[PDB]
Design a protein around this motif. Structure first.
Motif, mmCIF file in Angstrom:
data_model
loop_
_atom_site.group_PDB
_atom_site.id
_atom_site.type_symbol
_atom_site.label_atom_id
_atom_site.label_comp_id
_atom_site.label_asym_id
_atom_site.label_seq_id
_atom_site.Cartn_x
_atom_site.Cartn_y
_atom_site.Cartn_z
ATOM 1 N N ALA A 172 -0.452 3.932 4.666
ATOM 2 C CA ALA A 172 -0.130 4.463 3.348
ATOM 3 C C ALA A 172 1.220 5.165 3.423
ATOM 4 C CB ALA A 172 -1.211 5.431 2.872
ATOM 5 N N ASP B 152 0.538 -2.304 -5.412
ATOM 6 C CA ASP B 152 -0.629 -1.631 -4.860
ATOM 7 C C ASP B 152 -1.856 -1.914 -5.707
ATOM 8 O OD1 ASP B 152 1.684 -0.639 -3.773
ATOM 9 O OD2 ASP B 152 1.020 1.453 -3.712
ATOM 10 N N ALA C 26 -3.935 8.019 7.040
ATOM 11 C CA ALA C 26 -3.605 6.812 6.284
ATOM 12 C C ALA C 26 -2.288 6.368 6.916
ATOM 13 C CB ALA C 26 -3.491 7.079 4.790
ATOM 14 N N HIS D 93 -5.146 -3.811 -4.545
ATOM 15 C CA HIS D 93 -6.406 -3.111 -4.757
ATOM 16 C C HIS D 93 -7.423 -4.018 -5.426
ATOM 17 C CE1 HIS D 93 -9.365 -0.642 -6.761
ATOM 18 N NE2 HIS D 93 -8.789 -0.824 -7.935
ATOM 19 N N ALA E 101 -2.196 9.383 -2.338
ATOM 20 C CA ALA E 101 -2.837 8.659 -3.432
ATOM 21 C C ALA E 101 -2.452 9.241 -4.785
ATOM 22 C CB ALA E 101 -4.355 8.683 -3.250
ATOM 23 N N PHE F 37 0.849 -1.194 0.000
ATOM 24 C CA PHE F 37 0.000 0.000 0.000
ATOM 25 C C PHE F 37 0.886 1.245 0.000
ATOM 26 C CE2 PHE F 37 -4.541 1.179 1.547
ATOM 27 C CZ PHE F 37 -4.548 2.319 0.778
ATOM 28 N N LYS F 38 1.890 1.259 -0.886
ATOM 29 C CA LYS F 38 2.809 2.394 -0.959
ATOM 30 C C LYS F 38 2.051 3.703 -1.158
ATOM 31 C CE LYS F 38 6.368 -0.585 -2.994
ATOM 32 N NZ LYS F 38 5.585 -1.350 -4.005
ATOM 33 N N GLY F 39 1.098 3.731 -2.093
ATOM 34 C CA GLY F 39 0.264 4.888 -2.336
ATOM 35 C C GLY F 39 0.667 5.789 -3.491
ATOM 36 N N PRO G 119 -1.175 10.814 4.208
ATOM 37 C CA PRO G 119 -0.290 9.648 4.370
ATOM 38 C C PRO G 119 0.352 9.471 5.739
ATOM 39 C CG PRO G 119 0.184 10.835 2.338
ATOM 40 C CD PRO G 119 -0.690 11.718 3.155
#
Ligand code: CLA
Ligand code: CLA
Ligand code: CLA
Ligand code: CLA
Ligand code: CLA
Ligand code: CLA
Ligand code: CLA
Ligand code: CLA
Ligand SMILES: CCCCCCCCCCCCCCCC(=O)OC[C@H](COP(=O)(O)OC[C@@H](O)CO)OC(=O)CCCCCCCCCCCCCCC
Ligand SMILES: CC1=C(/C=C/C(C)=C/C=C/C(C)=C/C=C\C=C(C)/C=C/C=C(C)/C=C/C2=C(C)C[C@H](O)CC2(C)C)C(C)(C)C[C@H](O)C1
Ligand SMILES: CC(C)[C@H](C)/C=C/[C@H](C)[C@H]1CC[C@@H]2C3=CC=C4C[C@@H](O)CC[C@]4(C)[C@@H]3CC[C@@]21C
Lengths: 155, 80, 173, 38, 743, 179
Positions: free
Chosen positions: E493, E284, E490, E288, E497, E269-271, E486
């Motif tokens: 994250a 990711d 998050a 997802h 995003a 979930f690097k983002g 982030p």
């Protein structure tokens, strides 16, 4: 004033410019590989096209100008193609008119117009190769022009 | 205040009266056709000019002609 | 039902009485086209091809000293005689003979075989037999020449050699 | 199952004829390119 | 309890060409012969209107299930064509070797009339037309490395099309389901939620984990595409997957032991966007897809089907009722199970909205690799999905009006939300019209005011950053919140995003991939213009749907039909009063709104996002910061955007882009030809056709099919069609030429 | 157990097909005749059988003699290199020309006739030597069944020939002689 393209410097300049434009892109590719042969064919076609157009007349811009005054020396420019066009389109018109005249004799001409009768359509298409002669004799017999048609109030 | 006029070519089919949405037309006895009836427009004050009757007329040329003339509240179809 | 092809049926328009009937018509061209016009087309195509074949055979051995040495090749000879003006004169007397033999019914919608048969365009000076045997022999030799002329002109296109010059010491491609 | 009649309808016959005409024009244009003044 | 069972009719319709030779067989009126040229147009106008053919819902349902199969087959053929073009006439391998230097291209023009010049020097040996469809980036993201895979995919697509052809014919001539089928909305929803979308996303996630992830990881590590192991090798030899991702050493045991955290090598979930390719991290994306698959699968078990467990949509709908809505959603279930037009309206509106959302999310967060660096592809994809979404939305409104005019029932719609809305439709439309007027004034008037100020030399009195400022404080605030998400909202994250909200810029191949899109006064005004145009187009569509049955002007519009020309020159004039005409007007307004939306995206991207980056971080955009002070005036929008950027499409002659220039001119012609059909009436054309027919009669060449002018409604349709075609084609050629020549 | 009707499978309900020349097997586990015309499938099967028998015998015969005037640089008859070289030298181009001519001028009419219910599938009336005897009698139905079986075997053997050659890079006779 107009001068033959073969004796106009603008025509040769344009030919050299086009050849240069093609050669610039041709240099990037390799002699024997995909492409580079594709540009050589274009260069040869350019040479042939200019040699062919050299007989035409062109002014200062070097662009071939077409004389439509009807001079016999320029018949190939407009007279011959004009006559050939009239022949082709007169053939188209005459075959269409004959097919319509035949369909009107059927029970339901509308169905024939929607679903063309390939046999009779081809019968009238193949014929008519002498449409200029068929146009006459139809006119002389009085079968070409009509007499009374639909007209609204104040004729 | 549109003027609706019926001509002698009317065949008394009543389609104009049936298609009129303002009760402007009606059928009256007549002797110009076997149907024995002719279209009449005795309530033209309620006409709006929609020409639904003209569209519903079967005669070659419309036997009922609606001429748009004076405009009033009824003819403009204003509910306000 | 067709004699030529026993797996397909004989076309309804064709008939055994007309000369050359083999019932060979898989694409059913007889349908959608007048049987008489198609038959006449076959007859004339064969006659014109037969004459063309004899031209190519006797052109190897030139015999007209007035025109002297000619290209002797199909394309080159046609172009040479078209520029020389003789081909414009050859086109003439042919259309005239077409309008004369057909009696003016040159068009497909005009041509009507009233009192005649496809191919019976007069031209019987010797009053020789015209029975179905001679008519069948005529159409057969016409088909053979229709195929032969095409092969000869194609050979001239690819090899450039004349028919009898190509038949000897035959060379592959 | 009259497929011939359908193939003889106006859209099908028109598309086939125009396709043949365009093909003839294109073929003539590659065999005889840049044609002008006959 | 109702049994969710399948019942079908065998050999319901015979397979024969007999009906092919009788055009108009589906209509009673069209089967009596044309008699006029209007029949030809009516034949095509009512060809797909299955509701007008028969009055039976079963037949319509069957005619839809089939033809849906046909369209699916058509889509599969198109996809197969794209794959075959990529495998045979495209520089896909060369592009893979040098994605940034090679321009995507999969079309080769034949040398016939000098058109060979269109074969641009896209690189990679072959020369052709540069494709901006993103096919190359998508294929790379899917793990395609060789053209053999592209050929196999094309063959599979052709086979799938054949299957969708056979299925369509079989479900209409061999096994046609009865009306009981197609009315099982609970089962259809459960399957589409858990099987078409849930299982689909699950399978795609699996493919990415086993094919996309390893192949792309090796590609981004400097490994040549030919040296990368085949996709099947990563599945057979687990050692390779373990080496690339140690998580595979544990196998599936962690999944079944709930130790999902052991999948941190593949389920990340690097983002943010990948700094090597500029796109989203494939890990990711796989994570997802896995989450969306599990969520859709869980959602697919909500409705009740052939078992006691589940839910009833009718019960839920009827349960929702309040004081301000007498009967709530009562009767809506029967509406969505007895009228395909209602379902089509809802589905078209949602599909169009989904397409628009797709465009926004795809440009902001480039999902495919090297997609951001290929600005031509980015512009084309955003603009393309934006247009398809708008068209589907207008279609949604049109079908809503169709249902309202034909399938509406007063008994079904009694005191419910629909009936209660139709009751106060005047309040809805007058208040919405007031909102439209306010929006237009406060949006376009700001632009007009700025034009007047700049022309008068009174720049100090403008609505700009230097002069009076209108800053989108709310939008800017949301951007800041996203920038700080982030680390405060998050926790897991690792990056924002989208870098468009903030954070830092990303550069790939000396080109900007995604950088913060700062919003200013110009963006404030343009966003308000967007809202104004959306409000007017929705007003037109809503007005047409609410008054589709009746109005104070025409008390019985429903009896007249949904698509009728007018009621005549009465009541002052009743032209374009039918709902169909409202859709006709909504098309122009949607086109205007969408054109302005795509214009804003193109200009803003080329002036503040797309550009080049010189060593040391220096950034140089295509149009350096001109949108900040030039997008606040109509003159700037005409000089710095329509005139300055058009130089590429007008000077494209003599090069590979000449075609675009030609299309730029052709489109104009079409757009100008539409005016003919929009500013004219059929009465005049009928009289002209009368004179032409007399001329034909004088030569005994008149046709049996009486020539007639285009119907009033048909004329309006032709005019709008030409208008939209010309406008969209003009902006299409302009966008493509401008983005290809530069950037 | 089984159902009321049986099939040579011994566990299937007989399909529409009954007892046809070489069709006593009624081998239709997957519904193919229930949706597609039986004549169409029969014509396709017979055409496949004939072309495959010629291919099998041709592959074996090509490995002995190449006529000496054809380059034939590759001794593998079912290899892409040999196919491409023979296509370039015009041999296969001419085979394609005449085979397409037969299919369009005769094959298409033949299939249309058999689809209409007039011509028996795969019946071209080619019996130079009276080997099959009278049509639809002894020595014909049996011979037709023999043709069908030989063709099916040839089809399976052609698939085997191609796969074996592509995997061993050896000919049929060469592979039979060694490993
Ligand atoms: C290449 C070999 C060849 C073949 C296969 C044919 C075949 C045919 N020829 Mg042709 N011919 C040939 C060589 C050939 N010819 C050569 C080299 C010459 C010049 C010496 C001629 C001169 C010639 C003439 C003057 C005529 C024919 C005619 C015909 C047709 C006669 C059948 C018929 O009467 O009904 C017709 C059967 C049909 C199937 C109709 C043909 C299909 C279309 C409608 C033809 C034209 C369409 C085309 C797009 C129009 C463009 C122009 C055209 C010149 C290409 C037939 C299809 C006659 C004809 O065409 O009938 C009117 C006729 O007029 N031939
Ligand atoms: C529909 C989507 C989908 C599909 C079709 C597949 C399909 C496949 N996956 Mg997969 N996968 C998916 C999604 C999907 N996956 C998702 C969402 C995840 C989480 C991100 C994974 C994570 C994953 C991993 C980590 C692995 C696979 C593997 C596989 C392959 C074999 C699975 C197997 O039975 O091995 C079964 C493996 C087991 C360990 C069985 C568990 C119970 C055993 C019996 C324990 C008892 C002890 C015993 C002695 C075995 C010792 C094993 C130990 C040393 C690991 C297979 C083709 C495997 C593979 O083949 O790699 C290429 C593999 O290791 N998948
Ligand atoms: C049988 C076909 C046919 C024929 C013989 C004619 C003949 C004529 N037309 Mg006409 N026309 C046609 C079809 C035809 N038309 C069609 C289909 C249309 C609708 C597009 C028109 C629309 C039209 C207009 C608006 C006008 C004429 C006019 C005229 C006259 C002057 C020349 C001209 O302007 O043509 C113009 C030709 C066109 C605009 C397009 C022609 C369409 C195609 C290309 C040709 C028809 C092909 C036909 C389907 C072939 C059937 C073959 C059959 C064997 C199956 C002339 C007598 C003019 C006039 O009024 O007289 C002074 C005039 O203003 N035509
Ligand atoms: C429809 C009108 C039309 C006409 C009049 C011609 C005429 C001609 N073509 Mg042509 N062609 C056409 C359409 C047409 N073509 C189309 C639509 C294509 C596909 C784009 C082609 C592709 C083509 C190729 C590749 C070649 C020709 C060639 C030729 C010449 C060869 C001599 C000949 O008589 O063959 C007559 C040919 C026809 C009447 C057309 C038949 C076309 C078939 C379908 C063959 C094409 C096969 C294609 C590669 C694969 C499947 C196509 C699919 C439609 C089934 C010629 C005079 C050859 C040439 O250049 O000469 C040196 C050649 O190499 N054509
Ligand atoms: C989990 C089961 C399942 C799945 C996967 C689907 C999938 C689909 N359905 Mg469907 N449906 C189902 C169950 C299912 N349905 C049931 C149980 C019912 C009755 C209640 C319906 C009734 C129904 C209707 C009325 C319609 C659909 C339609 C569609 C398609 C929507 C178009 C699309 O989005 O393109 C996506 C396309 C793809 C992703 C390609 C995948 C295609 C393959 C073959 C998967 C589909 C398997 C199929 C449902 C069952 C195989 C049957 C077997 C005997 C061969 C889509 C392929 C619409 C349609 O398009 O008609 C054809 C439509 O009109 N469905
Ligand atoms: C999944 C999407 C979808 C579906 C399934 C339908 C289905 C249907 N629509 Mg609808 N519609 C849609 C989307 C959809 N529509 C959209 C997006 C719009 C806005 C544009 C509309 C607007 C609309 C209207 C206004 C009407 C319908 C109507 C209908 C019904 C009859 C259609 C017909 O027979 O016309 C036949 C179709 C044609 C003759 C084709 C017209 C071609 C146009 C101009 C498109 C050209 C596109 C192409 C790219 C142009 C460039 C190429 C060119 C150079 C050749 C039918 C049930 C009609 C109806 O309900 O009947 C009363 C109706 O009046 N639709
Ligand atoms: C670009 C805008 C435009 C164009 C091109 C035209 C064109 C035309 N108008 Mg016109 N008009 C316009 C706007 C336009 N108008 C506007 C805004 C109005 C105000 C309402 C009018 C009102 C008007 C009236 C009142 C009249 C015309 C008439 C005419 C025709 C005049 C005769 C002629 O020149 O025929 C030549 C044909 C052309 C110029 C069109 C070009 C040829 C096309 C492109 C070829 C066919 C299509 C081609 C194959 C490509 C498509 C392929 C397909 C697969 C998609 C002509 C077609 C008069 C008329 O009917 O003439 C008899 C007529 O009385 N117009
Ligand atoms: C092109 C191959 C082909 C075709 C078209 C046919 C067609 C036919 N066969 Mg035949 N068959 C074949 C090959 C073929 N067969 C082979 C190689 C052995 C047999 C043995 C056989 C017997 C014993 C019988 C038939 C019969 C029939 C007829 C009725 C049954 C049917 O419809 O099957 C249709 C079959 C097809 C349409 C072929 C497609 C099947 C799939 C999709 C192709 C892929 C198969 C693949 C190679 C298998 C790989 C296996 C691997 C996973 C291990 C029909 C005309 C019956 C009959 O009545 O004879 C007249 C009968 O008794 N067949
Ligand atoms: C006021 C707090 C909400 C902030 C405004 C934005 C909310 C977004 C939802 C849009 C509808 C507005 C909410 C009130 C609407 C609302 O929810 O009311 C409550 C009521 C729903 O309660 P019921 O008791 O009817 O519930 C039973 C049914 O809903 C069964 O589900 O809705 C109505 O009946 C009236 C509908 C619109 C009434 C006219 C208002 C139209 C104005 C539209 C513009 C809104 C403001 C624009 C933004 C500034
Ligand atoms: C109508 C009639 C008469 C008869 C008049 C005429 C004109 C009769 C016939 C004349 C001619 C010129 C020819 C007749 C038939 C021609 C044929 C059968 C030609 C066939 C050509 C072939 C088979 C080509 C062969 C090759 C091929 C194809 C390739 C070449 O590499 C080499 C070669 C092997 C030679 C006369 C007698 C005058 C008067 C009165 O009776 C009325
Ligand atoms: C394409 C193949 C692979 C698949 C298996 C085909 C199956 C066909 C359609 C057949 C085989 C058995 C089924 C079958 C059984 C019996 C028949 C009788 C016949 O009136 C056709 C329908 C009908 C009622 C159905 C049609 C649907 C099935 C499934």
């Amino acid at each position: 004033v107009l001068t033959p393209c073969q004796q106009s410097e603008a025509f040769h300049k344009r030919e050299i410019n086009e050849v240069r434009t093609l050669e610039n892109r041709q240099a990037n590719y390799e002699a024997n590989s995909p492409s580079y042969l594709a540009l050589q064919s274009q260069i040869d076609q350019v040479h042939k096209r200019f040699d062919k157009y050299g007989t035409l007349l062109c002014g200062q811009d070097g662009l071939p100008h077409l004389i439509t005054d009807g001079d016999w020396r320029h018949a190939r420019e407009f007279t011959i193609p004009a006559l050939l066009f009239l022949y082709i389109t007169g053939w188209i018109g005459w075959v269409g008119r004959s097919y319509l005249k035949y369909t009107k004799e059927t029970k339901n001409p509308t169905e024939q117009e929607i679903i063309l009768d390939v046999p009779m359509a081809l019968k009238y298409m193949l014929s008519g190769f002498l449409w200029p002669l068929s146009a006459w004799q139809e006119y002389r017999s009085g079968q070409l022009l009509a007499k009374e048609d639909e007209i609204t109030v104040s004729p | 205040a549109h003027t609706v006029k019926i001509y002698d070519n009317c065949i008394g089919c009543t389609q104009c009266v049936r298609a009129c949405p303002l009760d402007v037309l009606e059928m009256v006895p007549w002797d110009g056709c076997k149907a024995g009836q002719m279209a009449s427009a005795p309530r033209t004050e309620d006409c709006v000019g929609c020409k639904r009757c003209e569209t519903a007329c079967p005669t070659d040329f419309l036997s009922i002609r609606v001429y748009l003339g004076g405009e009033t509240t009824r003819s403009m179809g204003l509910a306000y | 039902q067709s004699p030529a092809l026993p797996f397909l049926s004989k076309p309804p328009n064709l008939s055994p009485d007309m000369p050359g009937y083999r019932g060979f018509d898989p694409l059913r061209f007889s349908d959608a086209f007048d049987v008489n016009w198609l038959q006449e087309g076959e007859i004339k195509n064969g006659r014109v091809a037969m004459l063309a074949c004899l031209h190519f055979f006797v052109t190897e051995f030139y015999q007209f000293p007035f025109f002297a040495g000619a290209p002797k090749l199909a394309g080159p000879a046609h172009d040479y005689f078209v520029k020389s003006g003789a081909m414009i004169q050859i086109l003439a007397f042919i259309g005239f003979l077409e309008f004369l033999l057909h009696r003016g019914k040159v068009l497909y919608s005009d041509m009507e075989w009233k009192g005649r048969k496809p191919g019976e365009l007069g031209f019987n000076p010797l009053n020789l037999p015209n029975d179905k045997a001679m008519r069948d022999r005529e159409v057969n030799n016409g088909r053979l020449a229709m195929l032969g002329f095409a092969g000869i002109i194609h050979g001239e296109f690819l090899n450039g050699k004349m028919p009898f010059e190509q038949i000897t010491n035959f060379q592959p491609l | 199952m009259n497929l011939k009649k359908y193939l003889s309808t106006a859209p099908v016959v028109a598309t086939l004829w125009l396709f043949l005409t365009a093909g003839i024009l294109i073929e003539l244009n590659r065999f005889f390119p840049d044609s002008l003044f006959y | 309890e109702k049994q969710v069972k399948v019942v079908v009719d065998r050999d319901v319709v015979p397979t024969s060409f007999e009906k092919w030779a009788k055009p108009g067989h589906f209509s009673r009126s069209l089967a009596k012969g044309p008699k006029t040229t209007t029949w030809i147009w009516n034949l095509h106008a009512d060809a797909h209107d299955f509701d007008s053919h028969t009055s039976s819902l079963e037949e319509v349902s069957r005619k839809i299930f089939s033809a849906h199969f046909g369209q699916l087959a058509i889509i599969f053929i198109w996809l197969s064509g794209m794959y075959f073009h990529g495998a045979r006439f495209s520089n896909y391998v060369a592009w893979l070797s040098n994605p940034t230097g090679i321009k995507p291209s999969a079309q080769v023009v034949w040398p016939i009339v000098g058109q060979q010049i269109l074969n641009a020097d896209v690189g990679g040996g072959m020369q052709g037309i540069q494709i901006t469809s993103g096919l190359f980036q998508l294929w790379r993201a899917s793990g395609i490395v060789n053209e053999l895979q592209l050929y196999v995919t094309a063959l599979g697509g052709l086979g799938m099309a054949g299957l969708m052809i056979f299925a369509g014919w079989f479900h209409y001539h061999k096994a046609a389901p009865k009306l009981e089928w197609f009315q099982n909305v609970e089962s259809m929803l459960n399957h589409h939620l858990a099987g078409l979308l849930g299982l689909g996303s699950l399978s795609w996630a699996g493919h990415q984990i086993h094919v996309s992830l390893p192949i792309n990881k090796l590609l981004d590590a400097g490994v040549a595409p030919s040296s990368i192991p085949l996709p099947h090798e990563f599945i057979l030899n687990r050692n390779l997957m373990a080496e690339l991702y140690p998580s595979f050493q544990q196998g599936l045991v962690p999944f079944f032991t709930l130790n999902w955290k052991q999948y941190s090598d593949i389920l990340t979930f690097k983002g943010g966007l990948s700094p090597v390719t500029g796109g989203l991290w494939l890990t990711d994306v796989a994570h997802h897809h896995l989450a969306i698959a599990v969520l859709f699968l869980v959602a697919g078990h909500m409705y009740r089907t052939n078992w006691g467990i589940g839910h009833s949509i009718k019960q839920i709908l009827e349960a929702h009722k309040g004081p301000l809505t007498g009967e709530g959603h009562k009767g809506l279930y029967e509406i969505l199970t007895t009228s395909w037009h209602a379902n089509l309206a809802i589905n078209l509106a949602m599909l169009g909205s989904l397409s628009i959302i797709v465009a926004h999310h795809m440009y902001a967060m480039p999902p495919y690799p090297y997609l951001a660096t290929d600005y031509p592809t980015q512009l084309s994809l955003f603009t393309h999905h934006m247009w398809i979404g708008g068209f589907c939305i207008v279609g949604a409104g049109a079908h809503a009006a169709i249902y309202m005019v034909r399938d509406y029932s007063p008994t079904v719609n009694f005191n419910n939300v629909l009936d209660r809305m139709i009751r106060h439709r005047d309040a809805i439309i007058s208040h919405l019209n007031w909102v439209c007027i306010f929006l237009g004034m406060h949006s376009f008037g700001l632009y007009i005011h700025n034009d007047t100020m700049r022309a008068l030399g009174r720049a100090q009195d403008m609505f700009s950053d230097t002069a009076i400022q209108l800053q989108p404080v709310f939008a800017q605030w949301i951007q800041q919140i996203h920038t700080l998400a982030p680390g405060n909202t998050a926790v897991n994250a690792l990056a924002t995003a989208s870098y468009a909200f903030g954070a830092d810029t990303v550069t790939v191949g000396s080109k900007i991939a995604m950088m913060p899109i700062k919003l200013g006064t110009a963006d404030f005004m343009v966003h308000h213009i967007h809202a104004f145009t959306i409000h007017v187009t929705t007003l037109i569509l809503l007005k047409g749907v609410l008054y589709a049955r009746n109005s104070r002007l025409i008390p019985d519009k429903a009896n007249l039909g949904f698509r009728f020309p007018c009621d005549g020159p009465g009541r002052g004039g009743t032209c374009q009063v039918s709902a169909w005409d409202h859709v006709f007007l909504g098309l122009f307004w949607m086109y205007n709104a969408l054109s302005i939306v795509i214009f804003h995206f193109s200009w803003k991207m080329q002036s503040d996002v797309w550009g080049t980056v010189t060593s040391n971080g220096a950034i140089s955009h295509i149009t350096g910061g001109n949108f900040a002070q030039s997008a606040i005036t109509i003159n700037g929008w005409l000089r710095d955007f329509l005139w300055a950027q058009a130089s590429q499409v007008i000077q494209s002659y003599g090069s590979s882009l000449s075609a675009y220039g030609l299309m730029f001119l052709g489109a104009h012609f079409v757009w100008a030809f539409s005016l003919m059909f929009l500013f004219s009436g059929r009465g005049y054309w009928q009289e002209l056709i009368e004179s032409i027919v007399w001329a034909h009669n004088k030569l005994k060449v008149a046709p049996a099919i009486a020539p007639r002018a285009l119907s009033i409604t048909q004329g309006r349709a032709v005019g709008v069609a030409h208008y939209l075609l010309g406008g969209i084609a003009t902006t299409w050629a302009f966008f493509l030429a401008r983005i290809i020549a530069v950037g | 157990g089984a159902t009321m009707p049986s099939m040579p499978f011994l566990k299937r309900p007989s399909k529409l097909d009954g007892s046809l020349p070489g069709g006593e097997g009624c081998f239709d586990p997957l519904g193919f005749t229930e949706v597609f015309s039986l004549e169409w499938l029969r014509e396709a099967e017979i055409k496949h059988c004939r072309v495959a028998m010629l291919a099998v015998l041709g592959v074996i015969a090509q490995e002995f003699g190449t006529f000496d005037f054809y380059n034939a640089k590759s001794k593998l008859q079912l290899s892409p290199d040999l196919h491409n070289q023979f296509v370039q030298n015009g041999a296969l181009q001419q085979i394609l020309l005449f085979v397409c001519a037969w299919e369009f001028i005769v094959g298409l009419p033949a299939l249309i006739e058999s689809v209409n219910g007039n011509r028996e599938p795969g019946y071209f009336g080619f019996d130079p030597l009276k080997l099959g005897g009278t049509v639809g009698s002894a020595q014909w139905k049996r011979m037709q069944a023999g043709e069908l079986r030989n063709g099916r075997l040839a089809m399976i053997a052609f698939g085997g020939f191609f796969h074996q050659q592509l995997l061993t890079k050896q000919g049929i006779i060469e592979q039979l002689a060694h490993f």
